[PDB]
C-alpha cells in the first residue's frame, strides 16, 4: 500500500506557550520544524529527547538537529529539519533563544496492536471492550467456558482483573502481595504459577485473537500484607510527616468517642429517634454539636503555647553582644510552620520582633515598654489566628454534618440502618493497632519514633477540589477539612520527592511493573488524577522501554477538556472512557453522539502540505458502568436495543460489560458477591438458571450489533449526521466519501414503558431519500410465556421472558412488517421514498441500507478518475469507462506547451475591470449585501481560517450551497471570449455537465477541488515559463512574482499607444463592438480602481519604474525593447509627455522622467548580454509633434542615436514653446497664468534647476476645493532647484557616456551648442569633474563648528541633514528630513563618501523607521501627523482636506533603497555591520510577508498609517510598489 507521504508544518512563536494543545501524530506522519514568521533573521538551536533508531531511549538525554537549506542559499525562509517518528511515547521538544529558555511543547504518538499470528494492524475503530472480573471468574481451571461465552458474544477485547493476593475485605483493587498467585485461584491437586497464567494468556491470544488488558495500582494497597514486615518506609508514617499531630489526635479522639457511644454508654442521657420529614434534623445537629465542641482542645493548646512562650521569654536574657541586621521595612512579623517543630525544644527567630520595634534607650523602662509591646502584638496575632481558624473549623463541622446527614438519609445508598462495630457510621481516618491513650502514655507515645514508625495511614479523595495538587507537601490542610473518604483497607503509598530516597523499593516496584507488562500486554490507569505524576511517568517510561507497543486507557472527571488534553500530552494517554449515563433524553444523547467525533456530511479535501492543527482525543462510548445504578431498574427493559444500536453506529468506539448481555433485574455489587458465572453450553439445554444456549433473546442481537460495528469500522465511515424533528426521530446517516453509500437506522420509543405509560397508536411518517435496497437489521420485541424469575444463590441468570428475533438479507417487498407507501418526486433530481408504519412495536429498531440513483455510480467514477488524473492525492477511485471522449486526451498538458501572458492575465479573477466595463450583475454574499465580487482569494481567506477549525456552519457555505448560480455566472464569463479562453470555457462546461448528476447537492466540494487543481496547473505552467531566479529563491519571491504578473491586465479599451508596424511581436485583437482590429498591448497601472479606466491607465515615472522592475525581473527583453521604442517615438523635445490621450491630448507640464528613462534604458542595455546589436537597429518615430499635426509613421527609420543627440542639444539650449494644446477650456485645480514653460540650465555651476511659484514640475498633487480650506496660488509644494536625485542621475549618465566613449562606442562626445554667436566645444569630462567638485564641496555640511565658507548657516533647522532643493526659495521647502538622497547614492555612490554618508544615514534613521516603513517626516517636527484621514474635516490646518499626505504617513517605494544603500556601505566597510544589515533586511521582508498574508486583494496597501488602520481610502495595490522589493530581493 503506497500511501502518500504526509508532511506537517509547525510554527513556533515566543508570544504564546503550547502546553495544552493536542499534537498527536502517528509513525507514518512526518513532523517538520519551521523558524516562524516572527523569528526570521535569528539563529536558534532545537533540542529534543528523541533517541536515534536502534538505540535505547533516554529521557534525560537531548540531541541537536542540524539545519539544511534545500535552496543552498543564506535565506532562512525555508529551513526545516527532518524528523521521522518511529516510536510511541511522550517525547518533549524545545528550542533555546541563544542562552535563555523561551518555550517548548509535547509530541504524542499513538501505539499499535498486533492481532493473531499475521500481526495485522487493527484500526482503533472496531474494538468492542468487554469487562471481566477475576472474582466472578471462579476457579482458574474453569476459564474456558467464560472465554468461549465472551468470544460468542462478539468482543475482540477483554478486560482482565489482575490476579493477586487480597486482604480480608475481599474487595477489588486491594492487592496485598504482588509477587505470587492468589491462593483462592488455586487447588491442592494442581498449583498454577505466573508462567501458567502467561502461557494461557498467550495461547488465548494466538488461537482466539483476544487482547487482555490488566490494571496497575499505585496510590493504594491492602492494610494487611506480607510486603511490609520490617521496613515501614514503604508507606507514609507519622515519623515522615510529624506536623499532622493534632489531626491524628482529633481522629483518635473521635474514634474513641464513637466506640464508647456504640457500646451502650451514651444511651441513658438520650438517643435520637429515626430521622423523618420534620424538625428532628436540627435537634440531631444540636445534640451532635453539644458534644463535638467540648471535644476540641483548642483553648488548652493556646494556653500551653502561651505558657511556653512566656517561659521562654523569662528564660531568655538580654545580651550586650547583639547583632541587628537591616530587615525589609515592608516585611511583617508572622508565625508559620507552627506544628513543624515539636514542643519542648522548638526554636523561633526573635530578630523580626527586634527589628519591628526600636527601643527608645537601654534603660529598664524602654526594655519593659518593648517587651509589653511585643506581648501585645503576639496576643493580637494569636487572637487573629484563632478568629481566622474558627470560621474554617465551623465550615468543616458543617460540611461533615451535611455529609453524614446525606449518608444516613441516602435513597440510593446501602441503607445499613443501625450503627454496628462492623459498619461504623464514620470510617476511621487512621489505623492504630496498639492500645489507645487512656491516662498518661500520650507523652511516651509522642517521644517514641521507633513505635511511631510502625504507624500506618490511609488515602482518600474529595470531589470538591482539583486532585492535581500534591498531597505530600508540608503543612497539608486538606485533611483538616474533615471531608476525606477512605476505605477500610486502602493504605496510602509514599514515594518521596526523588526516587533516590528508597532505591531498593523503587527498583522492586519497577521490576513488578515490568513483570506485569511482560505478562499482560494491556494496562489501565485508575484514579490517575490523584497519584503523583513523576512515579507514573517513570513506570510508563519503563514499560515503553521494555515493551515497544503498549496500550494505555484512562478516564477523568475534570469536566473541562483542558486537563484531559494536558494529561494526554504529558503522560501519553491514547484512549479515553466517557460515561453515556449523562443522557436523560433523546436530545442529549444525539448531542453526545454528534460531538463525540465525526464530521458533518459534505466536506472538501485537505491539501497534502497543510499546517498542523489541533486534534480531538479518542473516546470510548461505553454503554454501562460497574459502579453506578443499572439502567434496567431505573428505565424500561426495552431500552437496551436502542442503546446498542446507538453505540454501534458511533464514530468513536463501542463496548459493554457482562451486565448488558443478560437483562438481569438487579445491580451487581463488586464489594458483595459470591456467585459464579454461567458455564458455556451450546443449545441442548432448557436454559433455566445456568444452562443458557448460544443465542436465544439477547446474544444474537448483540452479535449482530458487534458484526455491524466491525463492518462499519472496516469500511471507513467518518461522516456523521444527526437530525431531530420530534421526540423520537433519532437516526444516523454516515456517508462514505469513496463509494457514496449511506446507511440509515430508525429507532423507536423505549424510554417509557408501553404498558406503564400510555402511548398513541398514530406515529409521524418519515420520508427516507433514495430507494431502499436491503434491510440489514430487523429486530422485533415480543412477550412470551415462561416461568417467573426466581433469585438464585449460586449463579446469576437473566430474565427469560424477553426475547427478540433478528433477520438479515430481507427484501423490502418480502418484509411483512413495513410496506412501501409510494414514490414521491419533490424535485427533478431528488428521489424520495415513503414508508408507512403499520406494526412497528415500540422498542424495536430497524436499519435501512439505502442506495443512490442508478445513474450516479458511473458519474461518480468518471468524476473521481478526472480528479485523480491531475494529482495522485486521490488514491484509487478509478472506474472503467465505455467510450469517454477520444478527442480530449490532454486538456491541460497540451495547454502547458503553448502559453501567453495576455490570455493568462485576462481571466484570472475578473476582479473589477470586467464589471466596470460591461457589467454582469454580480451578487456578492446575498445574505448581507455585497462584500466579495468574484475573487477566489476572497473565499480562500475564509476557507484557510475555517478549514483547520472544520467550521462548516459559516454563512458563506450556506449561501454557496443554497444555489448554483455562481457556476453559471463563471461559465458565462469564461465563454465570453474566443480561442484558448473559449476552449477552457468549453472544458469547464463539459466538466460541470459531467458533475451535474450527483445527489445531496455537494457540488461546491467538487467545484473547490477542480478550482484547486486548475490553480495548481496554472501556477506550475507559470513557474516553468519563467527565468531561473524564482526557483532558486524562497516562496516569497515566487509569490511576489505571481502578484506582479497578475496585477497587469487588458481591458476592452486599449490604453497603450499603437505600436509601429515595423515592430515585432505586436499583439492584435478584434473589438467586440466596432468589429475592427486593434492592438491589445498590456498597459501597466497601479491596480484597477474606478478612478483610472483606460484614459488614466497610463502615467509617467511611476509606470516607468514599475515596468522597469517587472520586465527586468521576469526577463521580458522584447517587451522592454518595444516599450523603449514606443517611448522614443512618442517623445517630443526630449521630454516625457506624462499623459497620453491616444490623440491630440498632451500635458507637458513636467520636465522630469527623462533622466529616469535614460537610467532605465542604460540598465536594460547593461543587464542584457550582447546588447550592442540593438543600439544600431532602425527606429521608426510615429508621433512627431514639433509645429504641426503628426504624420503617419513609416516615413523614416533613422537611428535613435541622432534622436537622443537632438534631444540633448535641445535640453542644453532650452525649450521655449507656447500653447502646447494643454487645457483648452478645462481647469479644476491647476492654474495657468503668467509664463511657465521650462526653466533651468545654469552656466558656470554644472547644476540644473527649475520650477515656478505658480507652476509645479514635480509629482506633487494634493489640494482641497473647499472655500474654507482654499490653498490655491502655490500648486502643492514644488522643489525649486536641484532635486538631489536628478544630479545623481545626470552624473551616472555622463559617467556611462564617458565609459562608452573610452571604448570607441558613441563617438559624439563633442558638443556643437552655440550661444550668443559663439560655439563651445566643452566635453562631458570637464562637466563631470565640475559636478563632482560641486557635490564634494557644497554638499559637505559639517555638524561641528567649521566650514566658515558657508551661506545662511542659521537658516537651516539643524545640522547633519541633507538639503532637498538647493537654491534660493522658502525655508520650508528644503529643510526637511526626506528619503530623497537614497536614490542619489544608489545610482552613483562614488560622490558620497564612505564615512560622512554612513554617519548621515545613521543619524537620519533613528526614529523614522516604523513597523512597515519610515515616516515621511521626523517625529520631533511640530507638524508631524501620524494619522491620515481625507474624509475627516476638522479645524486643524494640517488635517484639513488631507494636507498631511506627506507629513507622517509612510509610503512603500521610499523603503528598500535605504536598505540596499546600507548593505552596500556595510559590505565595503566591515563584516561587523553586514550581519546587522542582513538581520534587519530579513526582519523587513518577514514583516512584509506577514502583512501580505492577510491581504484580501493580494496587494500592498498605500495608506499604512499608525496603529495599523484598515479600509484604506486610496488604492490597495500599486504597480510601482513592487519594483523596489524585487530589487531588494535580488540584491539579497
Instruction: Compute the C-alpha angle 891/897/903, nearest 5°.
Output: 80
The set of cell numbers assigned to 205 is 491470544
Q: State how far the Cα of 86 lies from the Cα of 31, in Å rounded to an integer.
A: 11
Instruction: Compute the C-alpha angle 99/101/103, nearest 5°.
Output: 145
SS3 call for 974: helix
User: Residue 666 in contact with residue 655, Cβ under 8 Å?
Assistant: no
Residues 6+ apart with CB under 8 A from 1116: 1110
Cα–Cα distances (Å) from 801 to 314, 370, 664, 670, 791, in that order, read 87, 90, 11, 27, 15
Query: Which secondary-structure segment (H or E) carries 260?
Result: helix 245-262
Report yes or no on 1366 lying in a domain: yes
What does the DSSP assignment read for 457-486?
E---B-TTS-TTS-S-SSS--SGGGS--B-
Q: State how far the Cα of 1101 lies from the Cα of 1289, in Å rounded to an integer.
A: 14
Helix ranges (H only) for 979-1068 are 980-995, 1003-1024, 1035-1047
Pick the closest to residue 569 from 206, 938, 105 (CA basis): 105
Q: State how far the Cα of 984 lies from the Cα of 964, in Å rounded to an integer.
A: 20
SS3 call for 996: coil
Q: Which of 526, 541, 964, 1433 does the annotation list as catalytic? A: 526
User: Residue 1164 in contact with residue 1125, Cβ under 8 Å?
Assistant: no
Q: Which of 159, 220, 458, 529 does the annotation list as catalytic? A: 529
Pick the closest to residue 1121 from 1173, 1183, 1176, 1164 (CA basis): 1164
User: Residue 663 in contact with residue 632, Cβ under 8 Å?
Assistant: yes
Q: State how far the Cα of 501 lies from the Cα of 496, in Å rounded to an integer.
A: 7
Mutual orientation of helices 1003-1024 and 1035-1047 as an angle, nearest 10°? 100
Report yes or no on 1172 lying in a domain: yes
Q: State how far the Cα of 715 lies from the Cα of 257, in Å rounded to an integer.
A: 66
Cα–Cα distances (Å) from 1203 to 1144, 1178, 1199, 1200, 1210, in that order, read 22, 11, 7, 5, 11
Instruction: Compute the C-alpha angle 487/493/499, nearest 5°.
Output: 165
User: Residue 421 in contact with residue 261, Cβ under 8 Å?
Assistant: no
Active site residue 1152: no
- The verdict on 1073 and 1170 lying in the same domain is yes
- The verdict on 1258 and 1355 lying in the same domain is yes
- The verdict on 1199 and 1242 lying in the same domain is no
Last residue of a domain, one of 1371, 1393, 1415: 1393
Last residue of a domain, one of 110, 140, 166: 110
User: Residue 798 in contact with residue 688, Cβ under 8 Å?
Assistant: no
Q: State how far the Cα of 1482 lies from the Cα of 39, in Å rounded to an integer.
A: 10
- The verdict on 1177 and 1254 lying in the same domain is no
Phi and psi at 1399, nearest 5°, equal: -65, -40
Chain breaks in the chain (C to N over 2.5 A) after: none
- How many beta carbons lie within 10 A of that of residue 611, not counting itself? 13
Pick the closest to residue 1040 from 1031, 1050, 1030, 1049 (CA basis): 1030
Q: Is 1214 left (phi over 0), alpha (psi -120 to 50) or beta?
A: left
Report yes or no on 152 lying in a domain: no
For the CA atoms of 279, 280, 285, 290, the dihedral, rounded to the nearest 10 degrees, stands at 110
Per the structure, the complete domain to which residue 1173 belongs is given by 1049-1082+1098-1216
User: Residue 174 in contact with residue 488, Cβ under 8 Å?
Assistant: no
Identify any residues that bridge with 1135 across adjacent strands, giving them in sequence order: 1132
User: Residue 1284 in contact with residue 1380, Cβ under 8 Å?
Assistant: yes
User: Residue 1049 in contact with residue 1074, Cβ under 8 Å?
Assistant: no
- The verdict on 1125 and 1211 lying in the same domain is yes
* First-residue to last-residue Cα distance in the chain: 44
Q: State how far the Cα of 567 lies from the Cα of 529, in Å rounded to an integer.
A: 9
Report yes or no on 417 lying in a domain: no
Pick the closest to residue 240 from 36, 470, 501 (CA basis): 501
Active site residue 661: no
The set of cell numbers assigned to 469 is 495538587
**Cell 499505585 -> residue:** 218
SS (H, E, C) 631-682: HHHHCCHHHHHHHHHHHHCCCCCEEEEHHHHCCCCCCCCCCCCCCECCCCCC
b/e map 130-146, b = 16+ CB within 10 Å: bbbbbbbbbebeeeeeb
Report yes or no on 1000 lying in a domain: no
Sign of torsion, CA 444 449 450 451?
Answer: positive
User: Residue 772 in contact with residue 812, Cβ under 8 Å?
Assistant: yes
Q: Report which DSSP code applies to 1135.
A: B
User: Residue 677 in contact with residue 795, Cβ under 8 Å?
Assistant: yes
Query: Which secondary-structure segment (H or E) carries 281?
Result: helix 280-295
- The verdict on 1205 and 1319 lying in the same domain is no
Q: State how far the Cα of 1328 lies from the Cα of 1391, in Å rounded to an integer.
A: 11
Last residue of a domain, one of 1373, 1393, 1413: 1393
Q: Report which DSSP code applies to 788.
A: P
Mutual orientation of helices 1457-1469 and 1471-1493 as an angle, nearest 10°? 160
Number of structural domains the chain divides into:
3
Q: State how far the Cα of 1474 lies from the Cα of 1222, in Å rounded to an integer.
A: 51
Burial class (CB in 10 A: 0-12, 13-18, 19+), 601: middle
Report yes or no on 1077 lying in a domain: yes
SS3 call for 17: coil
Q: State how far the Cα of 1195 lies from the Cα of 1179, in Å rounded to an integer.
A: 11
User: Residue 555 in contact with residue 617, Cβ under 8 Å?
Assistant: no
Determination approach? cryo-EM
- The verdict on 1190 and 1234 lying in the same domain is no
- The verdict on 1149 and 1235 lying in the same domain is no
Pick the closest to residue 156 from 215, 112, 212, 206 (CA basis): 212
- The verdict on 1263 and 1304 lying in the same domain is yes
Q: State how far the Cα of 1037 lies from the Cα of 1034, in Å rounded to an integer.
A: 6
Q: Report which DSSP code applies to 242.
A: T
Cα–Cα distances (Å) from 70 to 76, 80, 82, 181, 1475, in that order, read 11, 9, 12, 60, 22
User: Residue 1417 in contact with residue 1423, Cβ under 8 Å?
Assistant: yes
Residues 6+ apart with CB under 8 A from 824: 767, 832, 833, 834
Q: Which of 66, 278, 627, 1227 does the annotation list as catalytic? A: 627
Q: State how far the Cα of 732 lies from the Cα of 725, in Å rounded to an integer.
A: 14
User: Residue 856 in contact with residue 775, Cβ under 8 Å?
Assistant: no
Active site residue 529: yes
Phi and psi at 963, nearest 5°, equal: -145, 165
Cα–Cα distances (Å) from 203 to 116, 152, 190, 1434, in that order, read 10, 18, 19, 90
- The verdict on 1255 and 1212 lying in the same domain is no
Pick the closest to residue 458 from 425, 480, 414, 427 (CA basis): 427
User: DSSP E strands: which ranges in 1116-1156?
Assistant: none
Here the CATH number for the domain that contains residue 48 is 2.60.40
Report yes or no on 1126 lying in a domain: yes
The set of cell numbers assigned to 48 is 529534543
Q: State how far the Cα of 1099 lies from the Cα of 1095, in Å rounded to an integer.
A: 10
Phi and psi at 102, nearest 5°, equal: -120, -40
Sign of torsion, CA 490 496 500 501?
Answer: negative
Q: State how far the Cα of 729 lies from the Cα of 120, in Å rounded to an integer.
A: 39
- The verdict on 1058 and 1128 lying in the same domain is yes
Q: State how far the Cα of 875 lies from the Cα of 3, in Å rounded to an integer.
A: 8
Query: Which secondary-structure segment (H or E) carries 1209?
Result: helix 1200-1213
Q: Give the long-range contacts of residues 353-362, CB within 8 A, separation 24 or more.
A: 353/377, 354/324, 355/324, 355/325, 355/327
- The verdict on 1235 and 1337 lying in the same domain is yes
Residues 6+ apart with CB under 8 A from 227: 176, 177, 178, 179, 221, 234
Report yes or no on 735 lying in a domain: no
Overall residue count recorded for the chain in this entry: 1532
User: Residue 1476 in contact with residue 1415, Cβ under 8 Å?
Assistant: no
Q: Is 1341 left (phi over 0), alpha (psi -120 to 50) or beta?
A: beta
SS3 call for 381: helix
Amino acid at each position: 500500500m503506497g500511501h502518500s507521504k504526509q508532511i506537517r508544518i509547525l510554527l513556533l512563536n515566543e508570544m504564546e506557550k503550547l502546553e495544552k494543545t493536542l499534537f498527536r501524530l502517528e509513525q507514518g506522519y512526518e513532523l517538520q520544524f519551521r523558524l516562524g514568521p516572527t523569528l526570521q533573521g535569528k539563529a536558534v538551536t532545537v533540542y529534543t529527547n528523541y533517541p536515534f533508531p536502534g538505540e535505547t531511549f533516554n529521557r534525560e538525554k537531548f540531541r541537536s538537529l542540524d539545519w539544511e537549506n534545500p535552496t543552498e542559499r543564506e535565506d532562512d525562509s525555508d529551513k526545516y529539519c527532518k524528523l521521522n517518528l518511529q516510536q510511541s511515547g511522550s517525547f518533549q521538544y524545545y528550542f533555546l533563544q541563544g542562552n535563555e529558555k523561551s518555550g517548548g511543547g509535547y509530541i504524542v504518538v499513538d501505539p499499535i496492536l498486533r492481532v493473531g499470528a499475521d500481526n495485522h494492524v487493527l484500526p482503533l475503530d472496531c474494538v468492542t471492550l468487554q469487562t471481566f472480573l477475576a472474582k466472578c471468574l471462579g476457579p482458574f481451571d474453569e476459564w474456558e467456558s467464560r472465554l468461549r461465552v465472551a468470544k460468542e458474544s462478539g468482543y475482540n477485547m477483554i478486560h482482565f482483573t489482575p490476579l493477586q493476593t487480597l486482604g480480608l475485605s475481599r474487595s477489588c483493587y486491594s492487592l496485598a502481595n504482588q509477587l505470587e498467585l492468589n491462593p483462592d485461584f488455586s487447588r491442592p491437586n494442581r498449583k498454577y504459577t505466573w508462567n501458567d497464567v502467561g502461557q494461557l494468556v498467550e495461547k488465548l491470544k494466538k488461537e482466539w485473537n483476544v487482547i487482555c488488558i490488566t490494571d496497575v495500582v499505585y496510590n493504594h494497597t491492602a492494610a494487611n500484607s506480607k510486603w511490609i514486615q520490617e521496613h515501614p518506609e514503604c508507606a507514609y508514617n507519622l515519623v515522615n510527616s510529624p506536623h499532622l499531630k493534632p489531626a491524628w489526635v482529633l481522629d483518635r479522639a473521635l474514634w474513641r468517642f464513637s466506640c464508647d457511644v456504640a457500646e451502650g454508654k451514651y444511651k441513658e442521657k438520650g438517643i435520637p429517634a429515626l430521622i423523618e420529614n420534620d424538625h428532628h434534623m436540627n435537634s440531631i445537629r444540636k445534640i451532635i454539636w453539644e458534644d463535638i465542641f467540648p471535644k476540641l482542645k483548642l483553648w488548652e493548646f493556646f494556653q500551653v503555647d502561651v505558657n511556653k512562650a512566656v517561659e521562654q521569654f523569662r528564660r531568655l536574657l538580654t545580651q550586650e553582644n547583639r547583632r541587628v541586621t537591616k530587615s525589609d521595612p515592608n516585611q511583617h512579623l508572622t508565625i508559620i510552620q507552627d506544628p513543624e517543630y515539636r514542643r519542648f525544644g522548638c526554636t523561633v527567630d526573635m530578630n523580626i520582633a527586634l527589628t519591628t520595634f526600636i527601643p527608645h534607650d537601654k534603660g529598664p523602662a524602654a526594655i519593659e515598654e518593648c517587651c509589653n509591646w511585643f506581648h501585645k502584638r503576639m496576643e493580637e496575632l494569636n487572637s487573629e489566628k484563632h478568629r481566622l481558624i474558627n470560621y474554617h473549623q465551623e465550615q468543616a463541622v458543617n460540611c461533615l454534618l451535611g455529609n453524614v446527614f446525606y449518608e444516613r438519609l441516602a435513597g440510593h445508598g446501602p441503607k445499613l440502618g443501625p450503627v454496628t462495630r462492623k459498619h461504623p457510621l464514620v470510617t476511621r481516618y487512621f489505623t492504630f493497632p496498639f492500645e489507645e491513650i487512656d491516662f498518661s502514655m500520650e507523652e511516651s507515645m509522642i517521644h517514641l519514633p521507633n513505635k511511631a514508625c510502625f504507624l500506618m495511614a490511609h488515602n482518600g479523595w474529595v470531589m470538591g477540589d482539583d486532585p492535581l495538587r500534591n498531597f505530600a507537601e508540608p503543612g497539608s490542610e486538606v485533611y483538616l477539612r474533615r471531608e476525606l473518604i477512605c476505605w477500610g483497607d486502602s493504605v496510602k503509598l509514599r514515594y518521596g520527592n526523588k526516587p533516590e530516597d528508597c532505591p531498593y523499593l523503587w527498583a522492586h516496584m519497577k521490576k513488578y511493573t515490568e513483570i506485569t507488562a511482560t505478562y499482560f500486554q494491556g494496562v489501565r490507569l485508575d484514579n490517575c488524577h490523584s497519584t503523583p505524576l513523576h512515579v507514573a511517568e517513570y513506570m510508563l517510561d519503563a514499560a515503553r522501554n521494555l515493551q515497544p507497543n503498549l496500550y494505555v486507557v484512562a478516564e477523568l472527571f475534570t469536566g473541562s477538556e483542558d486537563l484531559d488534553n494536558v494529561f494526554v500530552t504529558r503522560l501519553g494517554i491514547s484512549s479515553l472512557i466517557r460515561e453515556a449515563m449523562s443522557a436523560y433524553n433523546s436530545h442529549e444523547e444525539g448531542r453526545l453522539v454528534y460531538r463525540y467525533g465525526g464530521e458533518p456530511v459534505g466536506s472538501f479535501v485537505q491539501p497534502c502540505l497543510r499546517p498542523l492543527m489541533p486534534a480531538i482525543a479518542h473516546a470510548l462510548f461505553m454503554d454501562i458502568t460497574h459502579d453506578n445504578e443499572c439502567p434496567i431498574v431505573h428505565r424500561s427493559a426495552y431500552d437496551a436495543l436502542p442503546s446498542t444500536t446507538i453505540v454501534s453506529m458511533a464514530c468513536c468506539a463501542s463496548g459493554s460489560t457482562r451486565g448488558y448481555d443478560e437483562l438481569v433485574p438487579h445491580q451487581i455489587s463488586v464489594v458483595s458477591e459470591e456467585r459464579f458465572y454461567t458455564k458455556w453450553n451450546p443449545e441442548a439445554l432448557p436454559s433455566n438458571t445456568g444452562e443458557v444456549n448460544f443465542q436465544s433473546g439477547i446474544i444474537a442481537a448483540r452479535c449482530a450489533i458487534s458484526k455491524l460495528h466491525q463492518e462499519l469500522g472496516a469500511k471507513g465511515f467518518i461522516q456523521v449526521y444527526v437530525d431531530q424533528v420530534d421526540e423520537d426521530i433519532v437516526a444516523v446517516t454516515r456517508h462514505s466519501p469513496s463509494i457514496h453509500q449511506s446507511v440509515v437506522a430508525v429507532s423507536r420509543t423505549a424510554f417509557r414503558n408501553p404498558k406503564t405509560s400510555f402511548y398513541s397508536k398514530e406515529v409521524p411518517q418519515m420520508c427516507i431519500p433514495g430507494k431502499i435496497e436491503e434491510v440489514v437489521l430487523e429486530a422485533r420485541t415480543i412477550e412470551r410465556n415462561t416461568k417467573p424469575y426466581r433469585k438464585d444463590e449460586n449463579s446469576i441468570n437473566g430474565t427469560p421472558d424477553i426475547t427478540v428475533e433478528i433477520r438479515e438479507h430481507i427484501q423490502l417487498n418480502e418484509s411483512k412488517i413495513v410496506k412501501q407507501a409510494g414514490v414521491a418526486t419533490k424535485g427533478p433530481n431528488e428521489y424520495i421514498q415513503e414508508i408507512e408504519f403499520e406494526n412497528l412495536s415500540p422498542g424495536s429498531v430497524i436499519i435501512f441500507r439505502v442506495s443512490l440513483d442508478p445513474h450516479a455510480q458511473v458519474a461518480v467514477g468518471i468524476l473521481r478518475n478526472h480528479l485523480t488524473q491531475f494529482s495522485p492525492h486521490f488514491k484509487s477511485g478509478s472506474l472503467a469507462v465505455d467510450n469517454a471522449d477520444p478527442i480530449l486526451k490532454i486538456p491541460f498538458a497540451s495547454l502547458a506547451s503553448r502559453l501567453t501572458l495576455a490570455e493568462l492575465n485576462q481571466i484570472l479573477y475578473r476582479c473589477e475591470s470586467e464589471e466596470k466595463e460591461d457589467g454582469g450583475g454580480c451578487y456578492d454574499i446575498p445574505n448581507w449585501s455585497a462584500l466579495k465580487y468574484a475573487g477566489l482569494q476572497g473565499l480562500m481567506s475564509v476557507l484557510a481560517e475555517i478549514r483547520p477549525k472544520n467550521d462548516l456552519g459559516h454563512p458563506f457555505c450556506n449561501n454557496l450551497r443554497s444555489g448554483d448560480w455562481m457556476i453559471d455566472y463563471v461559465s458565462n464569463r469564461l465563454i465570453s471570449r474566443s480561442g484558448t479562453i473559449a476552449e477552457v470555457g468549453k472544458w469547464l462546461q463539459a466538466m460541470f455537465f459531467y458533475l451535474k448528476q450527483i445527489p445531496r447537492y455537494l457540488i461546491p466540494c467538487y467545484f473547490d477541488a477542480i478550482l484547486i487543481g486548475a490553480y495548481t496547473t496554472l501556477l506550475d505552467t507559470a513557474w516553468k515559463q519563467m527565468s531561473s531566479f524564482v526557483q532558486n529563491g524562497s516562496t516569497f519571491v515566487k509569490h511576489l512574482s505571481l502578484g506582479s504578473v497578475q496585477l497587469c491586465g487588458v481591458g476592452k479599451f486599449p490604453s497603450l499607444p499603437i505600436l509601429s508596424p515595423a515592430l515585432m511581436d505586436v499583439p492584435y485583437r478584434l473589438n467586440e463592438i466596432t468589429k475592427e482590429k486593434e492592438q491589445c498591448c498590456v498597459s501597466l497601472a497601479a491596480g484597477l480602481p474606478h478612478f483610472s479606466s483606460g484614459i488614466f491607465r497610463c502615467w509617467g515615472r511611476d509606470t516607468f519604474i514599475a515596468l522597469r522592475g517587472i520586465l527586468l525581473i521576469t526577463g521580458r527583453y522584447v517587451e522592454a525593447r518595444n516599450i523603449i521604442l514606443a517611448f522614443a517615438g512618442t517623445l517630443r523635445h526630449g521630454l516625457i509627455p506624462n499623459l497620453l490621450g491616444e490623440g491630440i491630448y498632451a500635458r507637458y507640464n513636467c520636465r522630469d522622467a527623462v533622466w529616469w528613462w535614460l537610467q532605465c534604458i542604460q540598465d536594460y542595455c547593461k543587464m542584457v548580454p550582447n546588447g550592442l546589436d540593438i543600439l544600431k537597429c532602425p527606429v521608426s518615430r510615429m508621433y512627431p509633434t514639433d509645429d504641426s499635426a503628426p504624420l503617419p509613421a513609416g516615413t523614416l527609420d533613422q537611428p535613435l542615436f541622432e534622436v537622443i543627440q537632438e534631444a540633448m542639444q535641445k535640453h542644453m539650449q532650452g525649450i521655449q514653446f507656447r500653447e502646447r494644446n494643454a487645457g483648452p477650456q478645462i481647469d479644476r485645480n491647476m492654474k495657468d497664468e503668467g509664463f511657465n514653460i521650462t526653466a533651468g540650465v545654469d552656466e558656470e555651476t554644472g547644476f540644473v534647476y527649475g520650477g515656478n511659484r505658480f507652476n509645479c514640475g514635480t509629482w506633487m498633487d494634493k489640494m482641497g476645493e473647499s472655500d474654507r480650506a482654499r490653498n490655491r496660488g502655490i500648486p502643492a509644494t514644488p522643489r525649486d532647484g536641484s532635486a538631489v536625485e536628478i544630479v545623481g542621475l545626470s552624473k551616472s549618465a555622463v559617467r556611462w557616456l564617458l565609459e562608452l566613449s573610452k571604448k570607441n562606442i558613441f563617438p559624439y562626445h563633442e558638443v556643437t551648442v552655440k550661444r550668443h554667436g559663439k560655439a563651445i566645444k566643452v566635453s562631458y569630462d570637464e562637466w563631470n569633474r565640475k559636478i563632482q567638485d560641486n557635490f564634494e564641496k557644497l554638499f559637505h555640511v559639517s555638524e561641528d563648528p567649521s566650514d566658515l565658507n558657508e551661506k545662511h548657516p542659521n537658516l537651516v533647522h539643524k545640522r547633519g541633514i541633507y538639503k532637498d532643493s538647493y537654491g534660493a526659495s522658502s525655508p520650508w521647502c528644503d529643510y526637511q528630513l526626506r528619503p530623497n538622497f537614497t536614490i542619489a547614492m544608489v545610482v552613483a555612490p562614488e560622490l558620497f563618501t564612505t564615512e560622512k554618508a554612513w554617519k548621515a544615514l545613521e543619524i537620519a534613521e533613528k526614529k523614522l523607521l516604523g513597523p512597515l516603513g519610515m515616516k515621511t517626516l521626523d517625529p520631533d517636527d511640530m507638524v508631524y501627523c501620524g494619522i491620515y484621514d481625507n474624509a475627516l474635516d476638522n479645524d486643524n490646518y494640517n488635517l484639513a482636506k488631507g494636507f498631511n499626505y506627506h507629513q507622517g504617513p509612510e509610503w512603500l517605494w521610499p523603503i528598500g533603497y535605504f536598505l540596499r544603500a546600507k548593505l552596500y556601505f556595510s559590505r565595503l566597510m566591515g563584516p561587523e555591520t553586514t550581519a546587522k544589515t542582513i538581520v534587519l533586511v530579513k526582519n523587513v521582508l518577514s514583516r512584509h510577508y506577514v502583512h501580505l498574508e492577510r491581504s484580501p486583494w493580494k496587494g500592498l496597501p498605500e495608506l499604512t498609517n499608525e496603529n495599523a488602520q484598515y479600509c484604506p481610502f486610496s488604492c490597495e495595490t500599486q504597480a510601482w510598489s513592487i519594483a523596489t522589493i524585487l530589487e531588494t530581493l535580488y540584491d539579497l
